[PDB]
């Protein structure tokens with residue numbers, strides 16, 4: 267694989283292209299509360315919906331602060347469009363830098379996310395203009411490749427993974443139209459099907475601490491190396507993405523847990539999950555669904571290449587993840603078919619979803635990467651080893 271074209275730094279424009287009449291480019295400063303609020307107001311009413319217009323992602327201000335001011339971030343890559351007259355923010359497209367491994371070639375990239383246009387400005391071909399602008403800002407900073415994810419099919423995806431969903435509060439999910447009552451069944455029966463133990467079972471399990479950063483960093487990198495496409499984590503990215511800072515972050519977004527071996531006290535495993543609510547668009551009974559999404563994890567068990575032993579360790583670790591997410595009042599636990607997730611999703615009672623997540627690279631070509639599913643879009647233990655990165 268490799269880059270499609272080389273960018274001539276000499277020819278990157280110092281000026282942006284023109285915009286629809288009445289609008290202008292604006293760099294966002296997300297360390298300004300007013301501007302974080304304005305981005306949150308845009309996304310909360312205009313970001314991704316489902317096909318039935320029942321739900322809309324509701325990224326919190328805390329999540330936005332976390333997702334967008336990660337190690338290495340530059341305000342130049344938080345791009346807005348404003349109305350010249352009202353000053354209203356009406357469109358956004360954002361990036362943060364990271365390094366990825368693509369079949370053992372390490373690449374410096376931007377991860378692109380939070381592309382959004384106000385409903386009133388849709389279907390005016392503003393997207394290509396937003397894309398071309400952030401591309402120009404990245405080129406000016408010596409970044410020439412990008413990775414991104416979308417729930418829609420666009421030119422040359424690198425992989426595709428299917429969403430899976432583990433009900434934690436089945437009755438809330440039913441009430442908001444997320445989960446069906448099938449059908450010869452009852453509420454009490456679906457609750458039973460979904461019941462979880464009150465307490466975790468992995469010996470040594472505890473919340474991740476700052477002291478664990480180096481050991482978790484080593485285990486995660488070793489683990490992620492078993493994937494064709496992966497995130498090449500730095501120590502600062504371990505600290506930022508996995509260790510919640512309660513002194514400075516009032517609405518927790520990341521949960522991470524480690525397994526401190528009872529005998530050796532070396533961390534032998536870990537997992538994590540993030541908080542992403544959806545607003546429930548029109549429901550007398552509820553206005554939100556509080557989803558937890560499985561994030562990164564690792565286990566020393568993987569290195570045996572004994573798949574039955576990996577499966578058993580993951581069944582235990584992941585059921586503990588479910589227990590902990592329910593304790594922290596999440597309604598549903600979401601995961602994709604990436605990493606080794608096909609090993610546990612169905613047995614731990616995750617239901618197959620209608621959503622898919624497609625992975626894309628800009629200005630980089632590589633063979634299709636397996637995303638955890640067969641041709642029928644079902645989880646397949648022979649289709650793993652491919653996607654090792656979780657985008658937000």
Ligand SMILES: CCCCCCCCCCCCCC(=O)SCCNC(=O)CCNC(=O)[C@H](O)C(C)(C)COP(=O)(O)OP(=O)(O)OC[C@H]1O[C@@H](n2cnc3c(N)ncnc32)[C@H](O)[C@@H]1OP(=O)(O)O
Pocket residue numbers: 312313314315376378379380381382383384387388389390391392393394397400401404405409410411412414415416417418420628
């Ligand atoms: C080196 C650095 C490189 C940096 C850049 C790397 C590329 C980054 C790429 C972006 C990664 C984003 C990652 C995320 O954030 S994925 C989530 C994106 N956001 C949403 O879904 C929010 C709800 N929807 C909207 O706000 C709008 O409907 C959007 C903004 C999505 C399009 O607004 P609109 O509906 O008014 O359309 P248009 O008339 O302006 O333009 C039509 C064109 O736009 C292409 N389109 C539609 N959806 C997407 C999409 N999700 N990715 C890329 N392209 C998309 C479409 O095929 C058509 O192309 P074509 O007909 O010309 O072929």
Ligand SMILES: Cc1nn(C)c(C)c1N(C(F)F)S(=O)(=O)c1c(Cl)cc(CCCC2CCNCC2)cc1Cl
Pocket residue numbers: 314315316317321322323415416417418429444544555600619620621622623657658
């Ligand atoms: C509860 C919910 N909120 N939203 C906005 C959506 C689409 C849902 N769902 C709905 F189907 F119930 S869902 O099944 O959990 C779901 C569905 Cl259907 C579809 C998708 C694809 C979303 C792709 C975006 C692209 C940007 N990065 C975050 C993911 C994700 C999810 Cl999480």
